[PDB]
Structure 1
């Protein structure tokens, strides 16, 4: 037992990380087969930057790619949306099985924070409803990726591009398409209002019950409509029948009907926690999906 914010093992991704330098700008690239993927704002020059203009003015040799202490020769470049694709003369021998997938708000992933092509740390993140992520990123971390692992296959979902004024983070999928209404220029962009991921809170309440926290349970129940009236009032997003269905296995393992857990969440929203904690938190946690809870409270590995 126990319940922790758990990231996927990062080794498969560590072997893909490289350093991309243009002029005085250095960030991280993702090296899969003979292509290095990186944010297009690495494109250097001596807001209003036209990246097509900037790139046509560039040569292959303007991009220095370092894989550890080995320099990768760039033989081609192209732009795909907000990412650069640097064709290199060497296929990465550590390329894992992978996919480029775009995730939904509410979904979680692991981030391998990197600087100068060197992995620094790994942590778990959720895509917020407003398409930001509450990450930990400093100068030079751009090009770090987010991912999930499913047996032996790495599903890359996120590449880091920028920080917004509230200290949250914005980026693209691996085809270069931004999550949310953000652009890779310097403007007055701001996150926009967020909501709490209701189905995830319920999943985490089920994790708590699995782990012996039961004090928040009650004998009351509620209808889905009646619950969603309360969710709206506390800035929780609506719960759908599909969310209820997704919570079925957790309901069945604990013997607590989904709508009964909703009754508990309702009382937690209306009353607070009265000095108590759930799974070591004094807040309702919304960054664990039902899959995350099942994975951890049952123990799936990856190879």
Structure 2
């Protein structure tokens, strides 16, 4: 019993972290097979950060411009024998294939989905945490200067699904990055220029999942006979900064185990949004939306 913010074991990903240097700029890279992935802003000098031209910067670079070092495990200097740009990322080719490359895929995450982040500094892993891709395509992490190139991922069976590479900080506690196809989540620019993020929203299906977790742990004071249909809730959601509720088999499993219908929890959300009234739910005083239905199913049952 109990519900905590849980991350995937980070061992397989730690073995892929490397340091990438270009001029006087240093950040983290991901070493898979003979390829090192890193943010392309490593090529940008301080005096050009106010308005950079990445196509011009790439042309000016040679294999000599990049230095790749592995610090963890058996340390090694990797020879860069090729360089290329894919969207907002650099794809460096090195002469040694990573002997600890896990079985992996590249996947893009959708808003409301959770993933683990391995935070790194100078190619060294320092911490791990779980985040949810926000409806405004940002993440609320903990990243300081030098954390760029830190990676986000999930684990499915024995396969690591790499979904995020840390790029920038937009505002206090608000971060964004790219998918491994080179596209930045939310189409933000990888430049130190003015850019406003859209309004964030509460992830409705995650709040329902968290309320089911509370019921399964003996906390059900907020459950009443009252119900709100998913059609009525979704119209209400549009005007109250909540995402559209879309049901799934994982949510249905939680409804059948507890005997509490989804519609009863949509009504509870509308009431709890106007105040918890000094009461707690799982040690929280405001709605929690960073626990997915799959997360609750895993932490509460074998499912």
TM-score normalized by the length of structure 2: 0.94
Shift of 1:286: 0.5
Task: Give 1:158-169 correspondences, 5 Å limit.
Answer: 158-169=164-175
Contact 1:24 1:44 in 2 (8 A): no
Cα-to-partner distance string for 1:141-160 (whole Å, 9 max, x where unaligned): 00000000011100000000
Cα-to-partner distance string for 1:190-220 (whole Å, 9 max, x where unaligned): 2221111111000110111111111111111
More deviation in 2-11 or 57-66? 57-66
1:297 and 2:291 correspond: no
The correspondence for 1:202, drawn from 208, 224, 241, is: 208
Q: Residue 11 of structure 1 corresponds to which residue in structure 2? A: 11
Shift of 1:83: 0.4
More deviation in 82-91 or 243-252? 243-252
Q: What SS does structure 1 have at the residue aligned with 2:273?
A: helix
1:267 and 2:271 correspond: yes
Q: Residue 20 of structure 2 corresponds to which residue in structure 1? A: 20
Q: What SS does structure 2 have at the residue aligned with 1:247?
A: helix
Cα-to-partner distance string for 1:112-138 (whole Å, 9 max, x where unaligned): 000010001000001000000011100
CA distance in 2, matches of 1:244, 1:101: 20
Contact 1:145 1:159 in 2 (8 A): yes
Q: What SS does structure 1 have at the residue aligned with 2:64?
A: helix
Shift of 1:245: 4.9
Q: What SS does structure 2 have at the residue aligned with 1:231?
A: helix
1:175 and 1:187, CA in 2 relative to 1: closer, same or farther beyond 3 A? same
Q: Residue 102 of structure 1 corresponds to which residue in structure 2? A: 108
Q: Residue 257 of structure 2 corresponds to which residue in structure 1? A: 253
Superposition CA RMSD, Å? 1.5
Q: Residue 282 of structure 2 corresponds to which residue in structure 1? A: 279
Aligned length: 297
1:138 and 2:144 correspond: yes
CA distance in 1, matches of 2:240, 2:278: 20
More deviation in 248-257 or 226-235? 226-235
Shift of 1:236: 1.0
The gaps in structure 1 that reach 5 residues or longer are: none
CA distance in 1, matches of 2:192, 2:44: 15
CA distance in 1, matches of 2:273, 2:149: 38
CA distance in 2, matches of 1:143, 1:89: 21
The gaps in structure 2 that reach 5 residues or longer are: none
Q: Residue 193 of structure 2 corresponds to which residue in structure 1? A: 187
Contact 2:44 2:52 in 1 (8 A): no
CA distance in 2, matches of 1:219, 1:268: 15
Contact 1:149 1:155 in 2 (8 A): yes
Cα-to-partner distance string for 1:233-262 (whole Å, 9 max, x where unaligned): 43112223xx25551111111111111221
CA distance in 1, matches of 2:76, 2:62: 20
Task: Give 1:152-163 correspondences, 5 Å limit.
Answer: 152-163=158-169
CA distance in 2, matches of 1:116, 1:232: 43
More deviation in 103-112 or 44-53? 44-53
Contact 1:165 1:190 in 2 (8 A): no
More deviation in 252-261 or 74-83? 252-261
Contact 1:37 1:86 in 2 (8 A): yes
CA distance in 2, matches of 1:141, 1:50: 23
Cα-to-partner distance string for 1:157-207 (whole Å, 9 max, x where unaligned): 000000003430011001210000301112111222111111100011011
Contact 2:51 2:193 in 1 (8 A): no
1:54 and 2:57 correspond: yes
Q: Residue 40 of structure 2 corresponds to which residue in structure 1? A: 40
More deviation in 59-68 or 10-19? 59-68
Q: What SS does structure 2 have at the residue aligned with 1:180?
A: helix
Contact 2:209 2:291 in 1 (8 A): yes
